[PDB]
Amino acid sequence: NVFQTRAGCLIGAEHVNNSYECDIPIGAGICASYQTSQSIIAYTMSLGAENSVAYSNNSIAIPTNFTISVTTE
């Protein structure tokens, strides 16, 4: 319902602690989206895929395959 965000006041949208990729920008690191019925929810946006990269002094990674893609600018 009413959520006191850091960028002012967002009313009419419940808050959820889960983080997903947001579409509509709002500001102050929090977005507003429409996910699961389904209602408009406000949550902190995800900065990327939270993964760990294994680093070692005697380990290398050589790719064996590739995909030919086309980047449209």
Partner: protein, 224 residues
């Protein structure tokens, strides 16, 4: 060759299926010009602090010696909007010139040859591009090189054989647990450790971490 030809035809079909489903860079330059032209016709519907909008209305009800102040307010009121529309178009012309000079540098590098600057013609290793015509703009269909599958292998910075260190030239020494090969950092191509791809310099006791490995020596069995 049949794998790259099939991956290239699938990449063209994925772009054609995505573009058939609007653009943003080719629409914001038209919507900003359409709203600016619709604003100028709305400026003729205002009075700028007078009793009428058009100058032909005050001349039919009042004399020009009397309505000379209302005419000057409409001229100076339209001169401010004409100075605003020209100034707003000059910033849009500077943004067009900044994008045309950026597209001219990408035409001479991504299209006219191979651009040595990585991550410049798009996300991935650029190979070539295919420019197409666009209304009030231009598009570029680059050919990127991104990896999909990869494996982890144990590497070694040098090779100690008889007291001298062996350093590679283009590849790197890899190993999957019991063997020893050499391949580049962009594709997995296992090759035998030979003399034509390595060289010697100094002694062995220079690296903090080194292992013992033998050389195939493709010159010894030929002189027998």
């Amino acid at each position: 060759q049949k794998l790259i030809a099939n991956q290239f035809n699938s990449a063209i079909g994925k772009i054609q299926d995505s573009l058939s489903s609007a653009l943003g860079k080719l629409q914001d330059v038209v919507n900003q010009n359409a709203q600016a032209l619709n604003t100028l016709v709305k400026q003729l519907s205002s009075n700028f602090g007078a009793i009428s909008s058009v100058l032909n209305d005050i001349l039919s009800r009042l004399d020009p010696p009397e309505a000379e102040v209302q005419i000057d307010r409409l001229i100076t009121g339209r001169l401010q909007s004409l100075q605003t529309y020209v100034t707003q178009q000059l910033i849009r012309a500077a943004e067009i010139r900044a994008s045309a000079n950026l597209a001219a540098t990408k035409m001479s590098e991504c299209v006219l040859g191979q651009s040595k600057r990585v991550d410049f013609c798009g996300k991935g290793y650029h190979l070539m591009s295919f420019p197409q015509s666009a209304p009030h703009g231009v598009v570029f269909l680059h050919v990127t090189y991104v990896p999909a599958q990869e494996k982890n292998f144990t590497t070694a910075p040098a090779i100690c054989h008889d007291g001298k260190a062996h350093f590679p030239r283009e590849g790197v020494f890899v190993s999957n647990g019991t063997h020893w090969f050499v391949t580049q950092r962009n594709f997995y191509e296992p090759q035998i450790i030979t003399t034509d791809n390595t060289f010697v310099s100094g002694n062995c006791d220079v690296v903090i971490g080194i292992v013992n490995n033998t050389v195939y020596d493709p010159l010894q069995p030929e002189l027998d």
